[PDB]
Amino acid sequence: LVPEKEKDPKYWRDQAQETLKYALELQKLNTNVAKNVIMFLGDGMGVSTVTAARILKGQLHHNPGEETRLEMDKFPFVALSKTYNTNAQVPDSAGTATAYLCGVKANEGTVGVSAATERSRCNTTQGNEVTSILRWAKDAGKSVGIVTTTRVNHATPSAAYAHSADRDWYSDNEMPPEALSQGCKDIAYQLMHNIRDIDVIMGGGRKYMYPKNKTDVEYESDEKARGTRLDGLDLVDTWKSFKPRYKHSHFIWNRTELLTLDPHNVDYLLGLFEPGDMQYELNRNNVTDPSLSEMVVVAIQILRKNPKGFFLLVEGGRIDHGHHEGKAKQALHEAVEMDRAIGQAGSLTSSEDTLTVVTADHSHVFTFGGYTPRGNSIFGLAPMLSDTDKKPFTAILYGNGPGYKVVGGERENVSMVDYAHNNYQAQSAVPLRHETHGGEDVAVFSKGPMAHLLHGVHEQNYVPHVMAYAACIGANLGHCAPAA
Amino acid sequence: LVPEKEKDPKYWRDQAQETLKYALELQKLNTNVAKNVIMFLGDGMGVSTVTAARILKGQLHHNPGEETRLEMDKFPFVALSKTYNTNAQVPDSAGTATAYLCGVKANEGTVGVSAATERSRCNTTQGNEVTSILRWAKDAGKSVGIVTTTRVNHATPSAAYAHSADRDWYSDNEMPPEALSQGCKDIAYQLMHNIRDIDVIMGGGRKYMYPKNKTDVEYESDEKARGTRLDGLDLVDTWKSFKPRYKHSHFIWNRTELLTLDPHNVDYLLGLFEPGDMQYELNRNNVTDPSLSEMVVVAIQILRKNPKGFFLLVEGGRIDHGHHEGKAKQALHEAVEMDRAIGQAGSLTSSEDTLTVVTADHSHVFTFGGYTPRGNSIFGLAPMLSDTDKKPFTAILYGNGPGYKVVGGERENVSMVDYAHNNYQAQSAVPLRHETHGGEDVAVFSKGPMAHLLHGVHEQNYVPHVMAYAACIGANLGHCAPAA
Amino acid sequence: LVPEKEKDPKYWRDQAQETLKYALELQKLNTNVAKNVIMFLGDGMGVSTVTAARILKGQLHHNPGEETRLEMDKFPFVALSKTYNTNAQVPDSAGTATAYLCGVKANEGTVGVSAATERSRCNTTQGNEVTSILRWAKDAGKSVGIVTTTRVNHATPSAAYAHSADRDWYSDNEMPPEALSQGCKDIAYQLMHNIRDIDVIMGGGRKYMYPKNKTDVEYESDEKARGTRLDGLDLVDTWKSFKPRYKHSHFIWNRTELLTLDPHNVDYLLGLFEPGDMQYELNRNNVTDPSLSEMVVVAIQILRKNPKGFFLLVEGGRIDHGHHEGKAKQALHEAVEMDRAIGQAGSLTSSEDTLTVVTADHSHVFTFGGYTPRGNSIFGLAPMLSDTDKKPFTAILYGNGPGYKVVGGERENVSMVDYAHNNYQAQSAVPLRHETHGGEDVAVFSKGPMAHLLHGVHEQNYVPHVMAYAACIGANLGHCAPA
Amino acid sequence: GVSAATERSRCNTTQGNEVTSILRWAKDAGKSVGIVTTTRVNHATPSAAYAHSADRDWYSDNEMPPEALSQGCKDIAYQLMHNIRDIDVIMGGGRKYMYPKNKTDVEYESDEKARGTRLDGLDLVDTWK
Ligand SMILES: *[C@@H]1O[C@H](CO)[C@@H](O[C@@H]2O[C@H](CO)[C@@H](O)[C@H](O)[C@H]2NC(C)=O)[C@H](O)[C@H]1NC(C)=O
Ligand SMILES: *[C@@H]1O[C@H](CO)[C@@H](O[C@@H]2O[C@H](CO)[C@@H](O)[C@H](O)[C@H]2NC(C)=O)[C@H](O)[C@H]1NC(C)=O
Ligand SMILES: *[C@@H]1O[C@H](CO)[C@@H](O[C@@H]2O[C@H](CO)[C@@H](O)[C@H](O)[C@H]2NC(C)=O)[C@H](O)[C@H]1NC(C)=O
Ligand SMILES: *[C@@H]1O[C@H](CO)[C@@H](O[C@@H]2O[C@H](CO)[C@@H](O)[C@H](O)[C@H]2NC(C)=O)[C@H](O)[C@H]1NC(C)=O
Ligand SMILES: *[C@@H]1O[C@H](CO)[C@@H](O[C@@H]2O[C@H](CO)[C@@H](O)[C@H](O)[C@H]2NC(C)=O)[C@H](O)[C@H]1NC(C)=O
Ligand SMILES: *[C@@H]1O[C@H](CO)[C@@H](O[C@@H]2O[C@H](CO)[C@@H](O)[C@H](O)[C@H]2NC(C)=O)[C@H](O)[C@H]1NC(C)=O
Ligand SMILES: *[C@@H]1O[C@H](CO)[C@@H](O)[C@H](O)[C@H]1NC(C)=O
Ligand SMILES: *[C@@H]1O[C@H](CO)[C@@H](O)[C@H](O)[C@H]1NC(C)=O
Ligand SMILES: *[C@@H]1O[C@H](CO)[C@@H](O)[C@H](O)[C@H]1NC(C)=O
Ligand SMILES: *[C@@H]1O[C@H](CO)[C@@H](O)[C@H](O)[C@H]1NC(C)=O
Ligand SMILES: *[C@@H]1O[C@H](CO)[C@@H](O)[C@H](O)[C@H]1NC(C)=O
Ligand SMILES: *[C@@H]1O[C@H](CO)[C@@H](O)[C@H](O)[C@H]1NC(C)=O
Ligand SMILES: *[C@@H]1O[C@H](CO)[C@@H](O)[C@H](O)[C@H]1NC(C)=O
Ligand SMILES: [Ca+2]
Ligand SMILES: [Ca+2]
Ligand SMILES: [Ca+2]
Ligand SMILES: [Mg+2]
Ligand SMILES: [Mg+2]
Ligand SMILES: [Mg+2]
Ligand SMILES: [Mg+2]
Ligand SMILES: [Zn+2]
Ligand SMILES: [Zn+2]
Ligand SMILES: [Zn+2]
Ligand SMILES: [Zn+2]
Ligand SMILES: [Zn+2]
């Protein structure tokens, strides 16, 4: 396409020199204290997904896109995060979360607990618990919030509150007899009982909260949507019970109630907007379900009221799922939506006292190549046909996953399919049920007080140690001590 | 494997708080002036490549691998660089090196010219040349060196001294008639003539220097190692004839003469170690050819004589050819070999005066992931088998290229083959003759003075401006005016 | 030009539909309490002036410019403000200030008093004083700050603390002895003595604080910089004196001191960076003198301490000087600089508890136009030459001012002149020493709590009344009324 | 600090029956707060300003029966530093309940009976700063 302004060297020079001046002003560091702390987590947002979703974002504005700036791009400080679990080389959603929430690396498949546990053997839990930064914030006075698009007892959000030996123990319904009978209690149970004054909780998981076979508020006619608690416990009610009566506690289940609440009025909030995982944003109901930006806006309004500050984890957690499904147009629109939410937060707070980290737990085997010309749709085709099998190919290609498609001994001629569809699954090399995670590092975008402390190549479990220090919470208290 | 020390949460807590202590000390920025600037370019060294190579270095020491620190991993300041070309969303090795060496972004396939130059069109070069940091540093009075493992007129180093409308014009042999008509000389010519006192040149490409059909000094029988020049010019000899009279000038071609040189006592070196590209470090002749770290060290020793400092450019540029061949084992080893060069360079210069920026031009469609357990070999296999055709797969997989191996509509059973061999090509999604570049972002690593200025998610063309500012060369001399 | 995307109707429809989608969501009105209040005041930044300024900001980035968004362009709520003074159809710098700061229109020439007072007559200042929103806000226990690129006692910042029957009475040197004997105080004396705890005061006007003939600290070889107080008073030392017992006061005078500051250690700041008016942004000493954005940042960094909130007045006051001189490139660069400063104010505060308001006191007779093509430089020429005298002309043109040039009965052919130059005076219709104000309306831009209350075409006095209601300060404070 | 649902020395009946004191209400509204007594500062009377316990006897953990500690409740001295962490003025007695078991006293260095008591090993004076 070649924009006309970009053929002028003065353009590229002027631009780089402006960039330089800013980097010269960034030498005055922010050594304030983090009153508030916010962490964004694109589940599965590796470095390649960041780029592809920057392109996507701008392309939704009829710009070439590669020139575009994400909201996460504007963060002054970036670093790289080594993401392997003690258990495995190519890590998982949960043990990574124990790293970047609890400050301790752990075995795959285990939340809230250290490496001294094995997965699914349950007596190995006690004495091997590590508490998260969300627990550190609450014990410090702050308000704590969790916002996600996955089940609020899924792998990423659990390690903010739970301590399980298996990520799969959503309720007692999916536990084995042994773990139950050995005393262990489900993630959905631990959401309500480990920290009982979690100010904001928003996401999915309505069906893990209600007594078995109880109908759903949204879908009566759906059986798989029905309750699963073998406890017979109404955990929505167990929740309302654990909050004082002279404080306003609201439980909502749809968008309309969400955009109806008065934030200066409510004290505790539980929004459970689907039985399990929430909608893809391409798939959402503008009526019944809210967006992630909507959840995050209201969440910060409630949590802003605490004068001690607050801590808010936000999981753009459905990015992982679009990739696992091999449906990249889903993964990428999911990531753009978590960027819209990042934008919102920066508008509702101030760089001067709020430390914001955007990062990923791990990455996927999502690539895009093919020498595509400037501005070529990210879901478009590489510019000419294969050197080998003489058929065209997509710019996006996966390393493994369900896109593998050899229609009769040869690979699909994607010219008369719709690669531009929402549920198109780009080809991969190894067919599988699901696409796997990637071992490559992920970036760490930091803004606000003490953000520069996230530098270089670090281990993933360094991430919450930085934040805890900046907000004078947790184990190290030096950034507030007069001894510093 | 799950190492024992790593089961104690004290272990990780102690490590992060170690890392936290280091991070606080970096609050004392290094505001010195860059006496010397050394830039390590790894042709095609994507984020995923760096991580995979970090593991391999550690696995060559029989450590688990994932917990290793490459030499480049020890740089304090990491950033993400946006790689796209004005022309091409997925860029090439030429127009990116215009950007990270001249600070201007260009069209794919051109070097040292603005985007107002159209590829292969010679009459569009005049008036659109843009000079390089290597030029800016000669003009400030420094020693300038180029040390690559590709040809010394390959697209990457050629952007440092040349201004050419097609990466492909190696000699005048490879130039169309009307391009010679119109007047613009080949690259090999420009290497000798544009900047006629380059202090160190070293790498491949010897055949491009000698006139057509002239037996190579090393490969006397080989017919493709003969010179290519219709010029008739002996450019090794022209290189000698430009240099000042009472200064000692040397031209080497085998590894032995390199180490016999006494650096304290040579002023102008030219080492041409192969008729074309130097061979992969795995096929390196201990006898006839030096390694990157051997070329680098001898180079630095000749350059630190100049009291005004030196700019060195080092390209570990067979990383790109590695991935392009699908031979992940080649490219990873190149990457590690370039890391060894980074350590050598570090122990021959001081941080207090030497800004060392390490980055890449672009990435590749190289991924790894298979849920491989901790310590797994990087070239090894994924633990359990494909859900869709029950065959095994390698943890390393490509998005395209020559690893696509269907053996009858079924995809090759790799339990049958040596998936750990050097020239083994991991499988790909789309069969192409050559694996393609990836359009995602690449890391920048920086240590030494002003290194904290390479900080965010920035355009690729930003890099040489930081370097030129740090060093008080080129356009913005502001780091050296009276302004402390 | 004609960018490639703008040829496609989907582009313009997608664009509108997202502009509309945002417009809907803005229906959930922000009714919070303005903890902090920030007012940005572009002196002379009329409506024509901010269209040209938005071109300029984007043209700096090598864009065509017209599609660029300023920072204030991003505020949700726009209004038109009727600027007329009470004895002047085309208003002045000071009497408007009485309106948009004190909520009361007044006569041209007078700060901080009502329309009862006649100019240069002190014996009508007696008992005709109106207080400003700075006073009202301080009176409710907020920190308050003034940050300007004119003198800190110029016409516009003097409406926040002074009640002076003549905007010329900068110090007592400039006052007729007839008024000194009626017993009035110069604005500079009034700064330090009326509201004695203003937390930040930043700008020009240093020479009015030191005693007469006193050699100046920055430009000492020069006597138009020397002290002017006949009082013999040292109001920098007088300023340090009225501060509470255990509080840190500074007084800084150069840019190095401004960024050395630790805003966790400075309760009262005073910063006087030039003897008189500060240097145009395009002329400024990178080293001795701070930009407007630099001053706004550490001003907010200090005032963020106070837990009750703060009020801050920011005046980009040198746009008026730029137009008055006919030098559009200075006036437009001053406007862009204040925009930068408006962007900074957005990242250091949050729109949930901060109402910020961007406006101008009045406009100028600055126009621009001549069927220029798209992307044409704002300081460039119309495409065709005058069909009458066959000579080029500049897109930017003035109603009056020093721009008028006739070289021997002949209007100046301008291809022969550097009309892009930082001091070029684009041609006018009536020559004058200084170009004049405009009597047209000026926009208001408001973001944050109760910002939607600045809504239509209102009188100019109505502005601080909305700011005061929303921050629960001053005379009407039913927005906090436990109901 | 507990309602009438709690039962004395039955720890697991604390959660959900805490009631907060006027001292807490006052700090929550921004007032400075102080507690000056001549008894120990974790004695019955002042403790109701900050603590919520099921037995007044639980001055430090050294006095707590283990199943109380097992069920997680913290001793009153602990709660004095942790519950409201900005009590402006705390004056009175109870120095021994603030330091780890057997640290001699700053004032009576040769008293058996005056050594620290904390099995937490904690220095609650530093905890407090
Ligand atoms: C969102 O949830 C609210 C529940 O508060 C729904 O409103 C209720 O709808 C039922 C069905 O007619 C009424 O009997 C209730 O009186 C309503 N309550 C309130 C507070 O309005 C609402 O319909 C839901 N919206 C959607 C789209 O499902
Ligand atoms: C891949 O598919 C395309 C289209 O399905 C094939 O190309 C078309 O062949 C028909 C045959 O008459 C033409 O009418 C079309 O114009 C062709 N082009 C397109 C874009 O439709 C193509 O040959 C197929 N190639 C392989 C290797 O399968
Ligand atoms: C490395 O290069 C040197 C120089 O080209 C080689 O040495 C030459 O050997 C012949 C044999 O008679 C002599 O006549 C030349 O004069 C020698 N030159 C010099 C400079 O000594 C040497 O053989 C080469 N070694 C390898 C391993 O290739
Ligand atoms: C993939 O190849 C492997 C090895 O070539 C097959 O596995 C072996 O097959 C032989 C057949 O005689 C058995 O005796 C071995 O016990 C098998 N296992 C191993 C570990 O060697 C395997 O069946 C092939 N799978 C497919 C789907 O083709
Ligand atoms: C900015 O102001 C500071 C302080 O007003 C100046 O520092 C003075 O430096 C001289 C030496 O050059 C000392 O003798 C003085 O004692 C310092 N002043 C004070 C008040 O301590 C500084 O030189 C000024 N810088 C510029 C660029 O104008
Ligand atoms: C306005 O000035 C321009 C020059 O700045 C005049 O144009 C030149 O006129 C001479 C002869 O009169 C020609 O030789 C040149 O080629 C013209 N062009 C330039 C760029 O110099 C123009 O005629 C003047 N017009 C009026 C009405 O005064
Ligand atoms: C847990 O129970 C199992 C019974 O299968 C036993 O073998 C194991 O030793 C127990 N673990 C511990 C830590 O006691
Ligand atoms: C949401 O509203 C838009 C209005 O433009 C409509 O086109 C869209 O179909 C609605 N949502 C979905 C999921 O379709
Ligand atoms: C560049 O060369 C071509 C080759 O003949 C010529 O046709 C063309 O006109 C030249 N470019 C311009 C701008 O004239
Ligand atoms: C290089 O030399 C080492 C020992 O010096 C030898 O063991 C190795 O096999 C050689 N490698 C090649 C590729 O020639
Ligand atoms: C007060 O103002 C009047 C205006 O009519 C003037 O004549 C008179 O002299 C003033 N007062 C004094 C004491 O001069
Ligand atoms: C201000 O600094 C810049 C450095 O980039 C320089 O180019 C410019 O000329 C300087 N101008 C003044 C007036 O100091
Ligand atoms: C207290 O403990 C007893 C057994 O020690 C238990 O049965 C009872 O349920 C507990 N109380 C509560 C309120 O859970
Ligand atoms: Ca719903
Ligand atoms: Ca050789
Ligand atoms: Ca000055
Ligand atoms: Mg997840
Ligand atoms: Mg190369
Ligand atoms: Mg003014
Ligand atoms: Mg008592
Ligand atoms: Zn995940
Ligand atoms: Zn996952
Ligand atoms: Zn390359
Ligand atoms: Zn004015
Ligand atoms: Zn004016």
Which residues form the pocket of ligand 11, taking CB atoms under 6 Å from any ligand atom? Answer: C 121, 123
Secondary structure class of A36 (helix, strand, coil) = strand
DSSP state at residue C444:
E
C-alpha atoms less than 13 angstroms from C-alpha of B175 in its C-beta half-sphere = 27
CB-CB contact of C378 with C51 (8 Å): no
Residue C319's identity, in one-letter code, is I
A423 alpha-carbon distance from chain centroid: 21
- Judged by CB atoms closer than 8 Å, whether chains meet at C62 and A1 is answered as no
Rounded alpha-carbon distances, angstroms, from residue A337 to A54, A316, A318, A343, B172: 11, 8, 10, 10, 53
In three-state secondary structure terms, C316 is: strand
**How many Å apart are CA B216 and CA B208, to the nearest integer?**
11
Task: Give the length of chain B.
Answer: 484
Strand, helix or coil for residue D96: helix
Integer Cα distance of A174 and C246 in angstroms: 64
Distance CA B209, CA B237 (A): 9
Q: How far is CA C231 from the centre of its chain?
A: 30
What letter would DSSP give residue A326? Answer: T
The answer to whether the Cα torsion of C120, C121, C126, C128 is positive or negative is: negative
Q: Report d(CA C101, CA C81) in Å as an integer.
A: 13
SS3 A342: helix
Look at residues B77, B132, B36 and name the one whose alpha carbon lies nearest to residue B470: B36
CB atoms within 10 A of CB B108: 24
Q: Which atom of ligand 5 lies at the shortest distance from residue C254's CA?
A: 1
- The answer to whether the beta carbons of residues B174 and B326 sit under 8 Å apart is no
Nearest to C349 among A61, A304, A350 (CB): A350
Closest Cβ opposite residue A105 in set B12, B48, B77: B12
Phi, psi of C455 (to 5 degrees): -120, -45
DSSP A149: E
Chain A contact for D29, CB < 8 A? Answer: no
User: Which of B254, B272, B286, B287 gets mutated to test ligand 3 (max ligand atoms within 8 A of its CB)?
Assistant: B254
Ligand 15 midpoint to CA B456 (Å): 41
Determine the Cα–Cα distance for residues C104 and C116; give it in Å rounded to an integer: 11
Give me the residues near ligand 19 (ion), CB cutoff below 5 Å: C 43, 93, 150, 154-156, 317
How far is it, in rounded angstroms, from Cα A453 to Cα D25? 37
Q: Are C347 and A348 in contact, with CB atoms under 8 Å apart?
A: no
C-alpha to C-alpha distance for C126 and C117, rounded to whole angstroms:
9
What is the residue with the minimal CA distance to atom 24 of ligand 3? B254
- Residue B131's identity, in one-letter code, is T
Answer for the pair A226, A218: CB distance below 8 angstroms, yes or no. no
Q: How many CB atoms lie within 10 A of CB B201?
A: 24
Chain A nearest-CA residue for B479: A24
Backbone angles phi, psi at B40, to 5 degrees: -90, 120
Contacts of A411 in chain B (CB under 8 A): 406, 430-431
Options B93, B114, B291, B293, the catalytic residue:
B93
Residue indicated by tokens 């979690």: A198
| Chain C CB within 8 Å of residue A67 CB | no
Instruction: Give the closest residue to B368 by CA, choosing from B391, B334, B398, B332.
Output: B398
Question: What does residue A200 show for φ and ψ, rounded to 5 degrees?
Answer: -125, 130
In the block, tokens 């510093």 appear at A484
Measure the CA angle with vertex D65, ends D60 and D66; round to 5°.
Answer: 105
SS3 content of chain A, % helix, strand, coil (to 5): 30, 15, 55
Angle (nearest 5°) at CA D22 between D16 and D26: 115
C-alpha separations of B18 from A177, B11, B69, B348, C204 in Å:
43, 11, 15, 27, 49
CB A144 within 8 A of CB A157: no
| A369 CA to centre of ligand 22 in angstroms | 23
Q: How would you write chain B as a 3-class SS string?
A: CCCCHHHCHHHHHHHHHHHHHHHHHCCCCCCCCCCEEEEEECCCCCHHHHHHHHHHHHHCCCCCCCCCCCCHHHCCEEEEEECCCCCECCCCHHHHHHHHHHCCCCCCCCECECCCCCCCCHHHCCCCECCCHHHHHHHCCCEEEEEEEEECCCHHHHCCCCCECCCCCCCCCCCCHHHHHHCCCCHHHHHHHCCCCCCEEEEECHHHHCECCCCCCCCCCCCCCCCCECCCCCHHHHHHHCCCCCCCEEEECCHHHHHHCCHHHCCEEEEECCCCCCCCHHHCCCCCCCCHHHHHHHHHHHHCCCCCCEEEEEECCHHHHHHHCCEHHHHHHHHHHHHHHHHHHHCCCCCCCEEEEEECCCEECEEECCCCECCCCCCCECCCCCCCCCCCCECEEECECCCCCECCCCECCHHHCCCCCCCCECCCCECCCCCCEECCCEEEEEECCCHHHCCCEEEHHHHHHHHHHHHCCCCCCCCCCCCC
Question: Which single residue is written with the structure tokens 């790799």?
Answer: B414
Neighbours of chain B (3+ CB pairs under 8 A): A
> Tokens standing for B366?
């190289």
Looking at the DSSP assignment, which residues form a beta bridge with residue B356? B38, B447
Residue A172 tokens, joined = 């007692």
| Pair C275, C216: CB distance under 8 Å | yes
Q: Which long-range contacts (CB under 8 A, 24 or more apart) does C284-287 make?
A: C285/C255, C286/C255, C287/B483, C287/C255, C287/C256
Q: Which of A20, A393, A461 sits opposite B12 (nearest CB)?
A: A461
Calculate Rg over the CA atoms of chain A: 23
Closest residue by Cα to residue B71 from B52, B43, B50: B50
Q: Which two tokens stand for residue C199?
A: 């937390």
Q: Are strands A36-41 and A310-315 parallel, antiparallel or unpaired?
A: parallel
DSSP characters over A40-101: EE-TT--HHHHHHHHHHHHHTTTS-STT---TGGG-SEEEEEE---SSBSS--HHHHHHHHH
The residue contributing the CA closest to ligand 11 atom 9 is: C123
Q: Is the CB of B254 under 6 A from ligand 3?
A: yes
Calpha distance A318→A156 (Å, rounded): 11
CA distance A347 to chain C (A): 6
DSSP conformational letter for C403: T
Q: How many angstroms separate the CA of residue D83 from the nearest CA in chain A? A: 9
A349 in C contact zone (CB under 8 Å): yes
C73 is known to lie in a ligand binding site: no
Task: Answer for the pair C359, C47: CB distance below 8 angstroms, yes or no.
Answer: no
The helix (H) or strand (E) run that includes residue C343 is helix C328-348
Residue where the block lists tokens 């895009």: A368
CA distance B190 to chain A (A): 22
Alpha carbons B440 and B301: distance in angstroms, whole number: 36
By C-alpha distance, the chain B residue nearest A454 is B23
Q: How far apart are CA C153 and CA C172, in angstroms?
A: 12
Pocket test for ligand 10, best of B286, B291, B337 (most atoms within 8 A of CB): B286
Locate B87 and state its tokens: 């022309």
Nearest to A242 among D16, D82, D85 (CB): D16
CA distances from residue B277 to B41, B43, B202, B225 in whole angstroms, order as listed: 16, 13, 11, 11
| Experimental technique behind these coordinates | X-ray
- State both tokens at A6: 């970009």
Integer Cα distance of A40 and A317 in angstroms: 10
Hey, what are D31's tokens?
Answer: 């007032």
Q: What is the CA B208 to chain-centroid distance, rounded?
A: 21
Q: What is the DSSP string of A210-222?
A: SBTTPPPSS-TT-
Give the three-class secondary structure for D58. Answer: coil
User: What tokens were used for C156?
Assistant: 């516009």
Residues 6+ away with beta carbon under 8 Å from A360: A41, A42, A43, A44, A45, A46, A81, A83, A442, A443
Strands A249-252 and A268-272: parallel
Q: At residue D22, what is the residue type? A: I
Atom of ligand 7 nearest to the CA of A124: 13
Nearest-by-Cβ selection for A73 from B363, B369, B457: B457
| Strand partners of residue A38 | A312, A356
Residue with tokens 């504005």: A61
Please check whether residue C153 is in contact with residue C198, taking contact to mean a CB–CB distance below 8 angstroms: no
CB distance from A174 to chain B under 8 Å?
Answer: no
By CA distance, what is A301's nearest residue in C? C352
Q: What are phi and psi of A143, to 5 degrees?
A: -90, 150
Helix, coil or strand: residue A368: strand
* Contact indicator for C107, C97 with CB cutoff of 8 Å: no
Chain B residue with Cα closest to A30: B27
Round to whole Å and give the CA distance between B164 and C90: 62
Residue with tokens 């992307």: C375
3-state secondary structure of A358: strand
Q: Are strands A442-447 and A36-41 parallel, antiparallel or unpaired?
A: unpaired
Which residues of C participate in catalysis according to the annotation? Answer: 93
Rounded to 10 deg, the angle between the B292-303 and B328-346 helix axes is 30
H-run or E-run covering A447: strand A442-447
User: Is C274:C289 a contact under the CB 8 Å cutoff?
Assistant: yes
Sheet holding B268-272, edge to edge: B249-252, B268-272, B200-204, B143-151, B310-315, B36-41, B354-359, B442-447, B77-82, B457-459
Q: What is the dihedral of CA B467, B472, B473, B477, to 10 degrees?
A: 110
Q: Return d(Cα C281, Cα C291) in angstroms, integer.
A: 7
Rounded Cα gap, residues C468 and C140, in angstroms: 11
Closest CA in chain A for residue D30: A307
Q: In the structure, do chain D and chain B come into contact, i.e. share 3 or more CB pairs under 8 Å?
A: no
Alpha-carbon Rg for chain B in angstroms: 23
What is the C-alpha separation between B233 and B210, in angstroms, rounded? 6
Distance CA(C137)–CA(C147), nearest Å, equals 16
How far, CA to CA in Å, does C294 sit from each of A350, A424, C267, C278? 17, 50, 18, 14
| Strand stretches in A94-208, DSSP E | 143-151, 200-204
CB–CB of D85 and A141 under 8 A? yes
Ligand 15 centroid from CA B310, angstroms: 27
Side chain identity at D76, as an amino acid letter? I
In terms of Cα–Cα distance, which of B215, B111, B100, B122 is closest to B458?
B100
B314: Cβ–Cβ under 8 A, 6 or more apart, which residues? Answer: B38, B39, B40, B41, B147, B148, B292, B296, B299, B338, B341, B345
Residue A4 touches chain C, beta carbons under 8 Å: yes
Q: Find the B192 Cα to ligand 9 centroid distance in Å.
A: 29
Q: What are phi and psi of C113, to 5 degrees?
A: -125, 170
Strands A143-151 and A310-315: parallel
Atom of ligand 10 nearest to the CA of B284: 13
Q: Going by CA atoms, what residue is nearest to atom 7 of ligand 10?
A: B286
Rounded distance between C-alpha atoms, residue C434 and residue C424, angstroms? 14
Closest CA to B187 of B231, B222, B145: B231
Q: What does the CA dihedral D34, D40, D46, D47 come to, rounded to 10 degrees? A: 120
Q: With contacts defined as CB-CB under 8 Å, which chain D residues touch A196?
A: 15
CA pair distance C92, C90, nearest whole angstrom: 7
Amino acid making up residue B88 = A
Exposed, middle or buried by CB within 10 Å (0-12, 13-18, 19+), for D30?
A: exposed
Beta bridge partners of B82: B459
**Sequence letter at residue A191:** L
**For the purposes of burial, counting CB atoms within 10 Å of the CB of C8, is it exposed (0-12), middle (13-18) or buried (19 or more)?**
exposed
SS3 state of residue C398: strand
Nearest residue to B409 (alpha-carbon basis) of A237, A431, C416, C108? A431
Widest Cα–Cα separation across chain D: 45
CB contact B7 to A (< 8 Å): yes
Q: Is residue C23 within a helix (H) or strand (E), and if so which, with residue range?
A: helix C9-25
* Residue C233 near residue C186 (C-beta atoms within 8 A): no
- CA-to-CA dists, residue A459 to A110, A155, A374, A456, angstroms: 18, 20, 35, 10
Backbone angles phi, psi at B158, to 5 degrees: -65, -25
Instruction: Ligand 1: list residues with CB < 6 Å.
Output: A 254, 256-257, 287-288
Q: How far is the CA of A121 from the centre of ligand 7 (A)?
A: 8
Residues with CB under 5 A from ligand 16 (ion): C 218, 273-274, 288-289
Measured CA to CA, the distance from residue C277 to residue C318 in angstroms comes to 8
Chain Cα centroid distance, residue A1: 35
The answer to whether B234 is a known ligand-binding residue is no
**Tokens standing for residue D80:** 């004095």
Q: Name the strand (E) or helix (H) holding A367.
A: strand A366-368
B406 C-alpha to ligand 2 centroid (Å): 23
Which residues is D33 bridged to in the sheet?
Answer: none
The CA distance from B155 to C255, in Å, is: 47
Q: Which residues of A are annotated as a binding site?
A: 43, 93, 156, 218, 273-274, 289, 315, 320, 324, 361-362, 437
C202 backbone φψ class: left, alpha, beta (φ>0; ψ -120 to 50): beta
Instruction: For residue C285, give the amino acid letter.
Output: N
Give distance in angstroms: CA of A71 to centre of ligand 5: 41
- Please return the burial class of A238, using the count of CB atoms within 10 Å of its CB with bins 0-12, 13-18 and 19+: middle
Q: Which residues contact A23 (CB under 8 A, 6 or more apart)?
A: B452, B453, B454, B455, B456, B466
